Amino acid sequence: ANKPCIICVAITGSVPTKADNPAVPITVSEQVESTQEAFEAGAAIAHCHVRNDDGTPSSDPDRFARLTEGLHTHCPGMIVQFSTGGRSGAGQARGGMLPLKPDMASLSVGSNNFPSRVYENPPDLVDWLAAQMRSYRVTPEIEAFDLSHILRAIDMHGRGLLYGKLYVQFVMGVKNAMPADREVFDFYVRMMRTRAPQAEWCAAGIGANQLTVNEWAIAAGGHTRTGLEDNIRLDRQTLAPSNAALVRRSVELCDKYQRPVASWQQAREILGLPAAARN
């Protein structure tokens, strides 16, 4: 394509533990180190959650602040994207980190099932989170778990609800949500190209679908995500030894399709972000 490809690394998430894979970074220091390697390997965006030291989920703003400072000092220029995840926190707590003014924050605009629960995003919460992102000038990345979420995001964006330039992530392979289905993927891409041609998109696959969805996205001209949050293995059994190892796989696919890996500067420009991180 020669079009640069933005690789996002989803470093930790809310679910995986060191019992699942010893490579999962849990503490801030672990996260900074893991993220730096990933940055070096080609990731331009860090998609961040925080944890308690024991690995349990957290939404604590002070932990986000600590992580951010580490990323700003060790990964200068890298785009810092905070989760507002529903497995990491509940209600308005899910937006308590927003006043820190990250570059970006992931945002669900719909609800859907998850492996063991409803992933709840009530309309009032969606609207509140979106308003906070307008206030603090935080560009959302929309985490679209189903088709109507893509359409909703497009409508919202046109209506001014979503700060900045529209960036939609197709999340595929989550149990009880949307599987990694190639025909659906192509329809998703069609919706973006036809209904939101000025917007950007990416795609993320879970588990064994991570690498496959990377390939789909990269070959189709979009952007993509990888990392331990989404997948802890290299095949049916083999554990992935780092976030960076997963990034390198994505990089190889960029090479295969003759697309440069977007630098953090390119990624900022593509996504309509400030040229330098705030704060």
**x-marked contacts with Cl ion along 247-266 as a string, rule CB under 5 A:** -x------------------
What percentage of the chain's residues is helix, strand, coil (to nearest 5)? 40, 20, 45
72, interface contact from its own copies, Cl ion, Zn ion, none, CB < 5-8 Å by kind: Zn ion
Q: Is 114 in the site for Cl ion (CB under 5 A)?
A: yes
Phi-psi label, residue 133: left if phi above 0, alpha if psi -120 to 50, beta otherwise: alpha
Judged by DSSP in three states, 46 sits in strand
In the bound state with its own copies, the residue whose beta carbon lies nearer, of 27 and 113, is 113
Q: Is 175 in the site for Cl ion (CB under 5 A)?
A: no
Q: Is 279 in the site for Zn ion (CB under 5 A)?
A: yes
Judged by DSSP in three states, 227 sits in coil
Give the up-direction half-sphere exposure of residue 139: CA atoms within 13 A in the CB hemisphere. 22
In the bound state with Cl ion, the residue whose beta carbon lies nearer, of 111 and 209, is 111
Instruction: From residue 56, give the alpha-carbon distance in Å to each of 49, 187, 228, 239.
Output: 11, 37, 16, 21
In the bound state with its own copies, the residue whose beta carbon lies nearer, of 40 and 120, is 120
Q: Is 117 in the site for Cl ion (CB under 5 A)?
A: yes
Judged by CB under 5 A, the residue of 116, 194, 238, 258 near Cl ion is 116
187, interface contact from Cl ion, Zn ion, its own copies, none, CB < 5-8 Å by kind: its own copies
Instruction: From residue 14, give the alpha-carbon distance in Å to each of 30, 66, 119, 147, 229.
Output: 15, 18, 13, 24, 7
Instruction: State residue 208 phi and psi, 5-degree precision.
Output: -65, -10
**x-marked contacts with its own copies along 117-156 as a string, rule CB under 8 A:** xxxxxxxx-x------------------xxxx--xx----
123, interface contact from its own copies, Cl ion, Zn ion, none, CB < 5-8 Å by kind: its own copies
Q: Is 12 in the site for Zn ion (CB under 5 A)?
A: no
